[PDB]
């Protein structure tokens, strides 16, 4: 017994580590990576089976080994040479969303808590939410990425069932209204900051669709958008 | 996916010099920097290797200067070699972790990995610097082998008796217990929401949140318990590196003498 | 990272599936310290038969251990509780069997003890893949709670049976269990060399490696929703392609959303698994190991 059992832990382990695990982990990745040879160097099982995800609330199925691709299109050229090299953003990289701004085209549709409908609401519409503690971030003059002050919160979208602030609605100098990612603002007791976003270009956060609803892709795209400000809004050094 | 990300990233040294990936690996100034410093140690490795005379990694190890040499000295053969393979240690594990924070900067990801590593090399620099200097000799460090670190740990705790007693220790196994705990946990709650009972939907968050209220009265963040394990995780492994600095230099009696402290008066 | 501003509603509640009985304490909100990390909302409870079962024997267990420790320093407290980490309750041990009829000081005190301990633990599993099936879960964490029952059930029922005493157990009492555990080592020629207990100590390390990462990169990709998890399990966004892209970028390869949680249940189960294999074999099969070793 003993280095019986030992050795044949080290068998099963082999079993556990290739098998059933990296391989769930080729499940909704490149199944396959190609712009190159679609493997190139050692195998994988060439992705595992099939699994389908039933989806609630609306209904759905997603057939997890995902064979999907972008066409969404990326604008990104090339440094050519090394076949595995840096793409060049071939227009203002934060509008196009490539690099530390991409989003994703996750589902048009907001994520329906347990019951149905929409996780994040805001707190106008929020059926008896209001602040716990610490200062409330309504009111206060958003800042830049310098003094430069670049609109007031205007209201707290929350999720609601985690029961957080997730964003910040924020009521630019425009009468515009757009939504700042809670863990990209730091909310002071006179000021409060996306000290991560100009102020020049806060303008081009995209937009929504229905003023009190947040889609996923929307929301993909907001928080993307924002992050590529941290690099890219050139003071951020 | 991944095309659109390999942008002209925001590397801290190397500029545009050293931004590119040899197959997925990213390089980076800290990527050459990082294998640098682990060839130098590789190869110096084989070189205490061939001069103890195995080639086998069970026998391999490489010791600190003797008790007496106090803080600097050593010759290769008699300890100079760990020395400069714990240099490389130092500056290969610290050119790792800038290469993170390079990446991240790239990714328009925050920090937080680096900063969960700095710890991790912490617990490992107590030993091998800190408690070392502090004790002023290089020799109650650590030998660089597969077994023969395991049996310096078995000499250094039963020095002070059954090191269980070590206070700081004791809550530091505590901590790795709950956070063991805590892992498996978090892990098959997304995994009985993500793959639902056999023939049926998708559980929500709030599938999540009612078990854990209806299994122990309570349910913490969903991005609380990944706080949570970023927590339980870098404080037991704070309170480990904690221990081991405070038994060479305040405590030098056998540990189970700490505890008489509560049983007196009587 | 903490909360920035803390938001309250009313009561959440969710489903509970089987009779509301998950009602106990539908109130608690502590605001001033829970709130600014994880969920503000203490309770509702799930108190049901096997609930009771549970809390009743667990309550048990400890309270014979209880008095049985009261003994020790005969009624007074203020002893007692300097006393409190020396005290303990040795099986029999009184070392002689299993031979169940022992008093109680030698093994009736211990026997009654664990037979509470046992029925605790047990019950609290049954209730873990109830309440799993009840919201439409199934056996996940009860899956990962045997691997904990294997090591707990390995030290102090199934080792003792395979070597005929009821001493072979580990005693109640804090002290006790820590130097149990060092003679452990001792006299089957220190636990390193035993190859499983190695194993163990990597995948403990292992465990404290892996969370310390994947909650990090949630906390890193927060930004993006990240923590959100069974969305993106269910439709990819950019938190799960960025983490990705981290992990491949540094170390060759990354894992799927939902298969790092596969990561995690196993790296943490195979802390326990592995263990009590570790001890079912040392004394039973091994009694030396590093003889065994020397055999390699
Ligand atoms: C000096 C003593 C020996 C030694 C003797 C032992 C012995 C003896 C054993 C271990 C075991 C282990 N040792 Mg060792 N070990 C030594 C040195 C080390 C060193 C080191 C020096 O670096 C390390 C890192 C370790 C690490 C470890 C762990 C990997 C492993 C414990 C698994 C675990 O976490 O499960 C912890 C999980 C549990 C204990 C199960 C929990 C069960 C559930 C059901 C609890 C329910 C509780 C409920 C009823 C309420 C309780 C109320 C209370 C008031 C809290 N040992 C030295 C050399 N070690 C264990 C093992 O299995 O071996 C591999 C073991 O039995
Ligand atoms: C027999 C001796 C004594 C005893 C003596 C000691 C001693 C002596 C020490 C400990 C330490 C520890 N003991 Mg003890 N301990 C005993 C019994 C136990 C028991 C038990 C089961 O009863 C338990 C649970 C523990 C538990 C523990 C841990 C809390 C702690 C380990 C710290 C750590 O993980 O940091 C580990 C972190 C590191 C070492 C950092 C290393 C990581 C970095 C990132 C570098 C690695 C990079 C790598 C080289 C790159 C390779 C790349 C390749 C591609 C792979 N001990 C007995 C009684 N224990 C240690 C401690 O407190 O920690 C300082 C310690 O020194
Ligand atoms: C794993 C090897 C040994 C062992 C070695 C150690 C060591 C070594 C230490 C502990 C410590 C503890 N052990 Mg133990 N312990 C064992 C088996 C057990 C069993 C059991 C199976 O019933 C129980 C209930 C306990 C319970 C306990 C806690 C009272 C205490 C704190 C850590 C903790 O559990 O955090 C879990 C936290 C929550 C669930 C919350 N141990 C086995 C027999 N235990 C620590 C202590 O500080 O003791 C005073 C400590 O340092
Ligand atoms: C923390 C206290 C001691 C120590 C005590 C122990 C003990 C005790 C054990 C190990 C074991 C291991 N140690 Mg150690 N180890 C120390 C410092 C180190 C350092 C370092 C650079 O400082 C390294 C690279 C290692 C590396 C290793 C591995 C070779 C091995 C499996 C660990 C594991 O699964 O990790 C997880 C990493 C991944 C899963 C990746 N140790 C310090 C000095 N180490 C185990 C072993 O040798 O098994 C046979 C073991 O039982
Ligand atoms: C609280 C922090 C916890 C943690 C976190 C953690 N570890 C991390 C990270 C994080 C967040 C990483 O980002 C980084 C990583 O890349 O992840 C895979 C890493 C990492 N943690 C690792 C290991 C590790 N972490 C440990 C511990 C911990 N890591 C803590 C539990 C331990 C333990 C338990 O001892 C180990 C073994 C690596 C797998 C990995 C990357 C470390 C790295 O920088 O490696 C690159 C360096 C080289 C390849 C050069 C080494 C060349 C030479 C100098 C040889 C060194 C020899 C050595 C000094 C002696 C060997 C003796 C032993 C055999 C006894
Ligand atoms: C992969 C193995 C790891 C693991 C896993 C694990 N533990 C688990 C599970 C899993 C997967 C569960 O599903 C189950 C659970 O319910 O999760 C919380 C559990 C569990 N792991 C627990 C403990 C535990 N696990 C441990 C370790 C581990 N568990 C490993 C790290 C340890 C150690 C030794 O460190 C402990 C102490 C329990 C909390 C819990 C359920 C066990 C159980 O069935 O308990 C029933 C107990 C009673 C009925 C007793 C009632 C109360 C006591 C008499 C007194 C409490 C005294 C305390 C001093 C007062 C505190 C008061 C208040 C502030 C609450
Ligand atoms: C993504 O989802 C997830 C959550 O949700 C967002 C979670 O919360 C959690 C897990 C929740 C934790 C609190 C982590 C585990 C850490 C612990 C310290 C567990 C122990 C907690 C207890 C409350 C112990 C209680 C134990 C017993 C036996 C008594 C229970 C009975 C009572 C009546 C308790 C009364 C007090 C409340 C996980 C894992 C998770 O993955
Ligand atoms: C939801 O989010 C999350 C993910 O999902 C996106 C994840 O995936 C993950 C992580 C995923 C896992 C699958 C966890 C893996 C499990 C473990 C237990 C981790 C430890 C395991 C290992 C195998 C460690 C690997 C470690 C190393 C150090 C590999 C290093 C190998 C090399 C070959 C190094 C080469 C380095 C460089 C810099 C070379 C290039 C440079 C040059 C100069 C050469 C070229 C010349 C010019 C997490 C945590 C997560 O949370
Ligand atoms: C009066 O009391 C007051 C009110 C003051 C409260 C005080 C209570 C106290 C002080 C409680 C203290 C508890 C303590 C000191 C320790 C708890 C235990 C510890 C530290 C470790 C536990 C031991 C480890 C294990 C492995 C135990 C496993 C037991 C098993 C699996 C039992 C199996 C079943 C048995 C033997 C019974 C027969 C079998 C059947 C089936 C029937
Ligand atoms: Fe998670």
Redesign the interface.
């Given at each position: 017994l003993a280095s019986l059992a030992i050795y044949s832990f080290w068998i099963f382990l082999a079993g556990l580590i290739y098998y059933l695990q990296t391989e769930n982990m080729r499940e909704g990745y490149p199944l396959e990576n190609e712009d190159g040879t679609p493997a190139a160097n050692q195998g994988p099982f060439p992705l595992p089976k099939p699994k389908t995800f039933i989806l609630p609330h609306g209904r759905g199925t997603l057939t997890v080994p995902g064979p999907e691709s972008e066409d969404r299109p990326i604008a990104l050229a090339r440094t050519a040479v090394s076949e595995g090299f840096p793409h060049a953003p071939t227009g203002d990289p934060m509008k196009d969303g490539v690099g530390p701004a991409s989003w994703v085209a996750r589902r048009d549709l907001p994520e329906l808590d347990g019951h149905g409908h929409n996780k994040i609401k805001p707190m106008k519409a929020a059926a008896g939410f209001h602040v716990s503690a610490g200062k409330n971030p309504i009111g206060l003059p958003v800042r830049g990425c310098d003094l430069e002050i670049a609109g007031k919160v205007v209201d707290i979208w929350v999720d609601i069932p985690e029961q957080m602030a997730r964003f910040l609605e924020v009521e630019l100098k425009d009468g515009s209204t757009r939504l700042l990612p809670m863990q990209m603002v730091k909310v002071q007791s006179n000021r409060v900051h996306v000290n991560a976003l100009s102020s020049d270009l806060f303008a081009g956060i995209p937009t929504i669709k229905s003023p009190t609803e947040v889609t996923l892709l929307e929301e993909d795209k907001i928080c993307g958008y924002v992050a590529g400000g941290l690099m890219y809004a050139a003071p951020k050094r | 996916?991944?095309?659109?990300?390999?942008?002209?990233?925001?590397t801290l040294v190397g500029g545009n010099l050293f931004?590119?990936?040899?197959?997925?690996?990213?390089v980076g100034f800290f990527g050459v920097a990082t294998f640098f410093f682990a060839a130098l140690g590789i190869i110096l490795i084989a070189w205490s290797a061939v001069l103890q005379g195995t080639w086998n990694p069970q026998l391999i190890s490489v010791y600190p200067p003797a008790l007496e040499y106090g803080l600097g000295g050593a010759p290769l053969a008699k300890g100079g070699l760990w020395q400069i393979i714990t240099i490389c240690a130092t500056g290969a594990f610290v050119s790792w972790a800038l290469?993170?924070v390079e990446?991240?900067?790239?990714?328009?990801?925050?920090?937080?990995?680096p900063?969960?590593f700095a710890?991790?090399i912490l617990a490992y620099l107590t030993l091998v610097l800190f408690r070392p200097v502090m004790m002023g000799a290089w020799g109650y460090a650590f030998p660089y082998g597969i077994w023969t670190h395991?049996?310096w740990?078995?000499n250094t705790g039963y020095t002070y008796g059954?090191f269980?007693?070590n206070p700081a220790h004791m809550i530091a196994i505590s901590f790795?217990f709950t956070?063991?705990?805590?892992?498996?946990?978090?892990?098959?709650?997304?995994?009985?929401?993500?793959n639902?009972?056999?023939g049926?939907?998708?559980?929500?968050?709030?599938?999540?949140?009612?078990?854990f209220?209806?299994?122990?009265?309570?349910?913490?963040?969903?991005?609380?318990?990944?706080?949570?394990?970023?927590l339980?995780?870098?404080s037991?492994?704070f309170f480990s590196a904690l221990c081991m600095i405070i038994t060479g230099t305040i405590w030098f009696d056998q540990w189970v003498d700490w505890?008489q402290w509560?049983?007196?008066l009587? | 990272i903490f909360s920035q501003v803390q938001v309250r509603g009313p009561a959440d509640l969710g489903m509970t599936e089987d009779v509301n009985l998950a009602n106990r304490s539908g109130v608690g909100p502590f605001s001033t310290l829970l709130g600014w990390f994880g969920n503000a909302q203490l309770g509702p409870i799930y108190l049901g038969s096997l609930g009771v079962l549970s809390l009743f024997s667990g309550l048990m267990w400890f309270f014979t251990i209880g008095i049985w420790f009261w003994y020790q320093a005969g009624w007074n407290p203020a002893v007692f509780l300097r006393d409190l980490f020396f005290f303990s309750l040795e099986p029999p041990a009184p070392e002689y069997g299993l031979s169940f009829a022992a008093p109680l000081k030698e093994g009736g005190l211990w026997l009654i003890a664990s037979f509470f301990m046992f029925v605790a633990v047990w019950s609290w599993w049954g209730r873990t893949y109830l309440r799993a099936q009840a919201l439409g879960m199934g056996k996940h964490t009860a899956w990962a709670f045997l691997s904990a029952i294997w090591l707990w059930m390995v030290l102090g029922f199934i080792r003792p049976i395979l070597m005929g005493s009821w001493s072979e157990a580990v005693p109640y009492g804090i002290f006790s269990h820590l130097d149990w555990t060092n003679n452990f080592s001792l006299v089957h020629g220190n636990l390193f060399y035993n190859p499983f207990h190695g194993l163990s100590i990597a995948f403990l390390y292992g465990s404290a490696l892996l969370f310390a990462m994947h909650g990090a990169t949630i906390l890193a990709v927060s930004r993006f929703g990240g923590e959100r998890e069974l969305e993106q399990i269910a439709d990819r966004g950019t938190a799960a392609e960025r983490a990705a892209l981290f992990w491949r970028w540094t170390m060759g390869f990354n894992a799927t959303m939902e298969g790092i949680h596969r990561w995690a249940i196993w790296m943490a189960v195979l802390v326990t698994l592995t263990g009590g294999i570790g001890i079912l074999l040392s004394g039973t099969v091994v009694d030396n190991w590093y003889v065994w070793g020397q055999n390699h």
């Open positions: - | 996916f991944e095309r659109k990300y390999r942008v002209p990233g925001g931004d590119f990936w040899v197959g997925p690996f990213y290469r993170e990446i991240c900067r790239k990714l328009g990801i925050g920090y937080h990995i900063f969960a710890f991790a395991l049996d740990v078995s059954n269980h007693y790795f956070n063991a705990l805590a892992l498996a946990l978090h892990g098959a709650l997304v995994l009985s929401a993500a639902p009972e056999k049926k939907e998708m559980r929500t968050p709030d599938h999540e949140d009612t078990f209220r209806d299994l122990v009265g309570y349910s913490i963040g969903t991005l609380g318990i990944h706080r949570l394990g970023l339980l995780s870098l037991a492994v505890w509560w049983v007196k009587p | -």
